[PDB]
C-alpha cells in the first residue's frame, strides 16, 4: 500500500513525450574505451584504432557497435576514454590520446587513482526550472527511482514531485527545491550504483545531508525522505510568516572565517551558515547588515551573491522549528554506515564504516540549527588521501567550492566529477560522469553503458590485441 504515479503526472508525461518526439533527433554521446598495462601500448592501440575508424569498414560501423566491442576488451591499469557523437570526433580524440595531448572530450591516465571516490551531496543554490526532466524521460532506471521517491514524498507531504519535474510552468520554492533536489540526488546515485559505481565516503552539505545519510547506509530511503520532508516543509512554512523586521538573509561572500571575525565585531547580529571554502563563507542576518558586508566586499572586487530567502537557516532563528522537527522525526531508525562519512554537521570529522549510527533525531536538529563545516570535511578528506570528489547535483555549484579547498590544501590535480548541469544534455553528462569513473579506475562496469547485442551488426571488427 503506497501511492502510484498520480493522473496529473501521467498526463504531463504524455505531453512531455510528444514535445520530445517532435524534436529534431540527435546523435548520442558514445564513450570509446582504450586501455593496456602500459601507457606506451595504450597510445599505440588508440592510433591503430583511429586508423581503422578512418578506413571504409570502420566508417561503415556505427559508433555504438564500436563502443560495444571496445567495452568487452579486458580493461587494464592504463586507461582512456574518448567521448564522441560522430566518427570524426572519435578519431580526433584518439589521435589526441595517441599523442598524449589534451582534449575536452578525452580523459586518459597512467594508472588508477589510489583511494575511492567521495560523493558530494550538496544542492543549495543548484535548483533550476527543468532540472531532472530530460533524464527522467530518457532513462528508465533514473525514472524508476524518481518514481519510488515520488511515491514516498506523497505519503509524507501529500503532493507529487514528479508533477513539479514534468511541468515547465512550475518554478521552485524553499520547500519544493529541497525535496526535488533530494529526489534527484537519490535517483542519480542509484543510477551510478546500477552501473557498478559506489562511494568510498560521503560528505553532505545542508539540504544534501539527507541523501548523503542514505548513500552512507545510515538511514533507509523511507527515513532519509522523512528527514528531507520534515525540515523542508517546516522551513517553507516558517519562512512564509516572516516579514520586514524579522526577515534574515543569506549571502555568500569572499571572506574567510577570520576576515569575518574582523567584520562580525562591527556587525554583531551576523552569523555563519556554511563554511564553504577557505575564503568563502555563507552568512545570514538582518538585511541592513548583510547588504553592508556585500557592499564592502563588492567594492573590493571580492565575490558576492545574495540568496532568495527571507529566513536564515543554520542560525538561532530556526529555534522555533526544532521541537516540531524533533516530533516529526519520531521513529526514524539510524543505522551503522556502510561507507565512510565526513560529517559537516559534526565539524567536518570522519565516521568509519561500521561505526556507531549518527543520524538520530538530534543530528537533524543540530544540522539545521548550526554551521555547516563544509570546507573542513573536504580538507579532511584530502588530508586522508582522497582525490576523487563526485557531486550528485542538478548543477555542480558545490564542486567549485571543493576546487578552492583542494587547492588550498596542496592538491592541484583532483578529479572533480560533476553530474548534471543547467543547459547541458542530461544523458550525455551522465555518460561523461561514468566515463571519468571508469578512467580513474574506480568501480564502474563499462559494459553496462551498452544495450545487450541483438545481432552481429551490434559489434565491430575493431583491431584485435591477442595472437
Amino acid at each position: 500500500e503506497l501511492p502510484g504515479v498520480t493522473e496529473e503526472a501521467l498526463r504531463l508525461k504524455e505531453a512531455a513525450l510528444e514535445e520530445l518526439a517532435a524534436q529534431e533527433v540527435t546523435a548520442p554521446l558514445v564513450p570509446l574505451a582504450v586501455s593496456a598495462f602500459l601507457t606506451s601500448r595504450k597510445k599505440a592501440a588508440a592510433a591503430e584504432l583511429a586508423d581503422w575508424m578512418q578506413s571504409p569498414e570502420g566508417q561503415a560501423s556505427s559508433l555504438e557497435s564500436i563502443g560495444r566491442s571496445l567495452s568487452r576488451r579486458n580493461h587494464g591499469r592504463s586507461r582512456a576514454v574518448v567521448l564522441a557523437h560522430d566518427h570524426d570526433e572519435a578519431i580526433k580524440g584518439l589521435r589526441a590520446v595517441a599523442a598524449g595531448k589534451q582534449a575536452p572530450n578525452v580523459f586518459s591516465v597512467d594508472g588508477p587513482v589510489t583511494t575511492g571516490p567521495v560523493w558530494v551531496l550538496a544542492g543549495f543554490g543548484a535548483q533550476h526550472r527543468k532540472m531532472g526532466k530530460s533524464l527522467y524521460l530518457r532513462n528508465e532506471v533514473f525514472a524508476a527511482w524518481i518514481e519510488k521517491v515520488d511515491a514516498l514524498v506523497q505519503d509524507e507531504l501529500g503532493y507529487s514531485v514528479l508533477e513539479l519535474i514534468l511541468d515547465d510552468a512550475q518554478d521552485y520554492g524553499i520547500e519544493t527545491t529541497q525535496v526535488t533536489i533530494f529526489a534527484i540526488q537519490i535517483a542519480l546515485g542509484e543510477l551510478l550504483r546500477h552501473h557498478g559505481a559506489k562511494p568510498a565516503a560521503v560528505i553532505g552539505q545542508s539540504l544534501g545531508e539527507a541523501a548523503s545519510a542514505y548513500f552512507a547506509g545510515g538511514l533507509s530511503l523511507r527515513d532519509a525522505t522523512r528527514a528531507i520532508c520534515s525540515r523542508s516543509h517546516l522551513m517553507g512554512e516558517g519562512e512564509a510568516m516572516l516579514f520586514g523586521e524579522y526577515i534574515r538573509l543569506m549571502a555568500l561572500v569572499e571572506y574567510s572565517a577570520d576576515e569575518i571575525r574582523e567584520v562580525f565585531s562591527d556587525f554583531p547580529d551576523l552569523e555563519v551558515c556554511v563554511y564553504a571554502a577557505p575564503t568563502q563563507t555563507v552568512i545570514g542576518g538582518p538585511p541592513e547588515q548583510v547588504d553592508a558586508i556585500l557592499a564592502r566586499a563588492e567594492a573590493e572586487g571580492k565575490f558576492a551573491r545574495k540568496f532568495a530567502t527571507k529566513g536564515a537557516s543554520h542560525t538561532s532563528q530556526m529555534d522555533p522549528l526544532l521541537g516540531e522537527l524533533t516530533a516529526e522525526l519520531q521513529g526514524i531508525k539510524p543505522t551503522s554506515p556502510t561507507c565512510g562519512i565526513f560529517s559537516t554537521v559534526h565539524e567536518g570529522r570522519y565516521i568509519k564504516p561500521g561505526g556507531e549510527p549518527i543520524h538520530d533525531v538530534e543530528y537533524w536538529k543540530k544540522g539545521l540549527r548550526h554551521s555547516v563545516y563544509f570546507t573542513h570535511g573536504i580538507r579532511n578528506a584530502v588530508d586522508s588521501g582522497h582525490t576523487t570528489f563526485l557531486e550528485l547535483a542538478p548543477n555542480p555549484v558545490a564542486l567549485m567550492q571543493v576546487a578552492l579547498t583542494t587547492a588550498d590544501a596542496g592538491l592541484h590535480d583532483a578529479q572533480l566529477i560533476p553530474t548534471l548541469a543547467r543547459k547541458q544534455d542530461e544523458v550525455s553528462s551522465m555518460v561523461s560522469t561514468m566515463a571519468q569513473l571508469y578512467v580513474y579506475g574506480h568501480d564502474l562496469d563499462i559494459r553496462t553503458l551498452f544495450s545487450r547485442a541483438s545481432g552481429p551488426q551490434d559489434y565491430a571488427n575493431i583491431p584485435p590485441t591477442r595472437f
Partner: peptide, 10 residues
C-alpha cells in the same frame, strides 16, 4: 567559473 559538455572546469 564554468563546467563544460563533459565535466571539466572550463
Amino acid at each position: 567559473d564554468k563546467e563544460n559538455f563533459w565535466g571539466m572546469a572550463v
